[PDB]
From Swiss-Prot, chain A:
Signal peptide: none annotated. It catalyses: tRNA(His) + L-histidine + ATP = L-histidyl-tRNA(His) + AMP + diphosphate + H(+). Homodimer. L-histidine binds at D73, L74, T75, R100, Q116, D120, R269, Y273, Y274. The gene is HARS1. This is Histidine--tRNA ligase, cytoplasmic. Its main location: cytoplasm. Changing P77H: In CMT2W; loss-of-function variant. Gene3D superfamilies: Anticodon-binding domain (3.40.50.800), Bira Bifunctional Protein, Domain 2 (3.30.930.10), S15/NS1, RNA-binding (1.10.287.10). It comes from Homo sapiens (Human).
Curated annotation (Swiss-Prot), chain B:
GO terms for biological process: histidyl-tRNA aminoacylation; mitochondrial translation; translation; tRNA aminoacylation for protein translation. This is Histidine--tRNA ligase, cytoplasmic. The gene is HARS1. L-histidine binds at D73, L74, T75, R100, Q108, D112, R186, Y190, Y191. It comes from Homo sapiens. The modification Phosphoserine is found at S13, S204. It catalyses: tRNA(His) + L-histidine + ATP = L-histidyl-tRNA(His) + AMP + diphosphate + H(+). It is found in: Cytoplasm. Pfam families: HGTP_anticodon, tRNA-synt_His, WHEP-TRS. InterPro entries: aa-tRNA-synth_II, aa-tRNA-synth_II/BPL/LPL, Anticodon-bd, Anticodon-bd_dom_sf, His-tRNA-ligase, HisRS-like_core, HisRS/HisZ, HisRS_anticodon. Changing T75I: In CMT2W; loss-of-function variant. SMART domains: WHEP-TRS (SM00991). GO terms for molecular function: ATP binding; histidine-tRNA ligase activity; identical protein binding; protein homodimerization activity; RNA binding.
């Protein structure tokens, strides 16, 4: 019986907390920029609410009332929220931990407790306006996160099942064909099609016709060239898809997001989910944020069953955390876990009480101060503390300096002091910091 | 139907979120003012980590791996974190959900100082932080009653200790707003020195105290580490501040959007898109209604219902002049300004 955290969970040390807080600040400043409200659901949904998904869900003991299960997702508690509250229209974000009892990776990548960050627009609006604002938010966040260059892959589910019908897939086999052509973004088309024909039983006569399609990506001229596609310009589903994507491109150009977006027919994920557009943000390589339009979901909890057409995105914050805390281990620079603005110290031997008097004045004024919990602390150790915690300023109290009603304001990094009268001290600390 | 959020647990509408964020804002703005790091633990530990009244604990099924258990306290994960990392010194707060089956899922706000420190300094600071938080927390007075475990017991050292705390508090200007009362007993199974709680004058608002053995439990060497803590019953405070907020008539905003880019004319959606992107790329946080051709009245009513005080009206006459029309939803007066002046002209009126 050892001291540790359950297999796959993890303590967040104060440094990690600082990183995650600084990422969350960017993200939430954007969500608030677009006027999104915030909601919060319980950490466990009433067991039978989470039925219809993979049974990797933590179950709880009876031991009293009913049975329960911890949430493996954030969008299902959202659908429950809208059905329960009888809401026809909301723009929200939701940032909270999720729990999936998978085998925790040892490489790593995958945990059992981790953070999920979802943003959603729910309601029946005019066509592709909210779907486009989602991409806008995605690129504001990714750009403002300073994590290098990113690209946004977009597609439509209708263009999918439509093109897959046109090439020739069995609807009893179409699923794993999407689960396979999805892998093209990470392996070659040849290692896709050889694995495909090698494990699928469908004629390469068909897989080749798929290959002429899925191997294509480009800008608006691609949705327009595929509008000219005679074999495709005859499918209702697909025509709808390419249309929505066309108008979406127009709105994106208006938003200035024209360049960082590519129409990539290889993208094919979450079909138990997406009924319209599908996003995936990538770096320059790996996934960072994804999402799309999913209308038939939220209506799966209404008494009647009226459709709640929803679009949304989800930021992969658990990865961005690592990208940051490893851009920080790269530059070998420290991260400030605290906001402390000055440390109050004294080199003389019986000045602890006066130190307290000063610190309480600096707190009451508002500036974030601190002192060391020893009656007669030695000044060199006291300055080492500031050098470690990144504290920028030290306010030193001396007896003959007390006689003059002043304070020595030694900078920890410049090592240069200055006598400042007790009157001006507050505004002076306020001057040398933020 | 019968879609039920589990018993004892309720959701959080944006109206309630608006309250919890402000309360948490003065709280965190205070714990940051004293230079306190923050840590976060998993929501569940091992069941055996949460042993010795003790069966109000939430458990998990056998799974096929370990027996896990939802946390019923924040100082127990604190203790296993201190013992795990062999940390002999840390000042730390923590605001997260706890799960005690008796509400049932509720927020705990713990703040504890730990380390070998000269007599009664961290205790006095815990009191100063309690008074800062509660004072800036809008409510009335506090008269936080303090006491000692070692006097209820040897009982001399506690008299000396509380004797040493009072002058520190007088230096903090805190003396007058505390008290000395000995009927204060609960809780007492885990505390070891000072014990205290505040009470609101018009109850369980804030409580805590020094406890030193609670951490040395998990230490294999038994090397006990001292500690002095405080917890703020934020679930009461949420209700009291949202209760004062209804008796004060003022609406509680759930959004911060300062402009709604609008148009009364038709076919001007795309121009409104150019505008909302120019405003979003800038600092200001505008919004736009999701319809190609909305009517101005619907948008203005949306603004007077959401709290958005400014409306960016785009008209063709306005468009071709390089100028955008601006109507304050409150005063209904109009000012038409250059597109270049628009961003700073919104930052100015907000």
């Amino acid at each position: 019986f050892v001291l540790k955290t359950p297999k796959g969970t993890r303590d967040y040390s104060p440094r990690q907390m600082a990183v995650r807080e600084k990422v969350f600040d960017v993200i939430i400043r954007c969500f608030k920029r677009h006027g999104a409200e915030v909601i919060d659901t319980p950490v466990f949904e009433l067991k039978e609410t989470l039925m219809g998904k993979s049974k990797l869900i933590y179950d709880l003991k009876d031991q009293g009332g009913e049975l329960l299960s911890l949430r493996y997702d954030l969008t299902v508690p959202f659908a429950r929220y809208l059905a329960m509250n009888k809401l026809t229209n909301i723009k929200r974000y939701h940032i909270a931990k999720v729990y999936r009892r998978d085998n925790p990776a040892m490489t790593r990548g995958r945990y059992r407790e981790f953070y999920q960050c979802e943003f959603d627009i729910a309601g029946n609006f005019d066509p592709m306006i909210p779907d486009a604002e989602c991409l806008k938010i995605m690129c504001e966040i990714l750009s403002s996160l300073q994590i290098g260059d990113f690209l946004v892959k977009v597609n439509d589910r209708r263009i999918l099942d439509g093109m897959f019908a046109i090439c020739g897939v069995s609807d009893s086999k179409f699923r794993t064909i999407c689960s396979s052509v999805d892998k093209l973004d990470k392996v070659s088309w040849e290692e896709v099609k050889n694995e495909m024909v090698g494990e699928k039983g469908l004629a390469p006569e068909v897989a080749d016709r798929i290959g002429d399609y899925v191997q294509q990506h480009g800008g608006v001229s691609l949705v327009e060239q595929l509008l000219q596609d005679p074999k495709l310009s005859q499918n209702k589903q697909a025509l709808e898809g390419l249309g929505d994507l066309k108008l979406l491109f127009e709105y994106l150009t208006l938003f200035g997001i024209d360049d960082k977006i590519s129409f990539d027919l290889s993208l094919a994920r979450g079909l138990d989910y997406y009924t319209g557009v599908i996003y995936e943000a990538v770096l320059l390589v790996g996934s960072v944020a994804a999402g799309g339009r999913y209308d038939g979901l939220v209506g799966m909890f209404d008494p009647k069953g009226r459709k709640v057409p929803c679009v949304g995105l989800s930021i992969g914050v658990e990865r961005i955390f690592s990208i940051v805390e490893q851009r920080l281990e790269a530059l070998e620079e420290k991260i400030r876990t605290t906001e402390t603005q000055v440390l109050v110290a004294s080199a003389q031997k019986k000045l602890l009480e006066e130190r307290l008097k000063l610190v309480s004045e600096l707190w009451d004024a508002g500036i974030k101060a601190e002192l060391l919990y020893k009656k007669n602390p030695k000044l060199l150790n006291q300055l080492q503390y500031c050098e470690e915690a990144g504290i920028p300023l030290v306010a030193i109290i001396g007896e003959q300096e007390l006689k003059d009603g002043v304070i020595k304001l030694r900078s920890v990094t410049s090592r240069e002091e200055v006598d400042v009268r007790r009157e001006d001290l507050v505004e002076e600390i306020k001057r040398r910091t933020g």
